[PDB]
Amino acid sequence: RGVQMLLTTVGAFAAFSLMTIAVGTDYWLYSRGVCKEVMTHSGLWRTCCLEGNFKGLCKQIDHFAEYFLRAVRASSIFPILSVILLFMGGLCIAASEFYKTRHNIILSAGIFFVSAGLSNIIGIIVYISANAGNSYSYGWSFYFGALSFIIAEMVGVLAVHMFIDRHKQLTG
Numbered sequence: 028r029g030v031q032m033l034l035t036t037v038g039a040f041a042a043f044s045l046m047t048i049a050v051g052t053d054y055w056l057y058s059r060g061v062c063k064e065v066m067t068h069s070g071l072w073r074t075c076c077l078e079g080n081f082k083g084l085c086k087q088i089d090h091f092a093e094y095f096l097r098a099v100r101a102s103s104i105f106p107i108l109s110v111i112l113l114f115m116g117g118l119c120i121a122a123s124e125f126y127k128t129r130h131n132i133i134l135s136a137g138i139f140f141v142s143a144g145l146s147n148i149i150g151i152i153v154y155i156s157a158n159a160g161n162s163y164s165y166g167w168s169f170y171f172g173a174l175s176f177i178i179a180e181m182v183g184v185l186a187v188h189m190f191i192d193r194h195k196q197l198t199g
Contacts, residue, residue, distance in 0.1 A: 060074060106146075132159055
């Protein structure tokens with residue numbers, strides 16, 4: 028009893044915090060490069076030198092048919108959508124405590140949490156393939172992105188489970 032609403036609200040906060048950190052940090056890809064050759068860590072927006080005379084200097088990464096994947100990478104729309112959709116899911120499951128007995132809000136939260144995970148997957152694929160445009164390796168903010176997807180799918184499943192559980196009781 029109640030554990031489902033606790034676990035959903037906590038999972039949604041966890042997913043949102045993980046994804047907002049992941050999208051907002053500079054540690055997606057370890058690679059060689061130049062910031063102004065040294066080992067360099069790139070996020071989504073900025074690439075910063077970590078092991079040399081400009082240790083701690085960042086430049087905005089220059090992202091510029093084939094044009095359109097470049098544009099999708101430059102905007103990173105799908106990561107940001109995953110944050111927006113997790114926020115909307117939170118503003119569903121942290122609102123369903125009021126206006127109780129409509130039940131469609133929990134389904135809307137579940138649909139949001141699932142579709143945000145799909146958006147995270149498309150974001151990951153776009154990032155992995157735009158970086159295909161070697162010694163490289165991925166960093167904690169990428170793995171936090173994946174963990175946000177994994178938790179988002181769970182909170183989605185629990186939201187659909189609460190939608191059904193609170194539906195069947197309408198029969199008494």
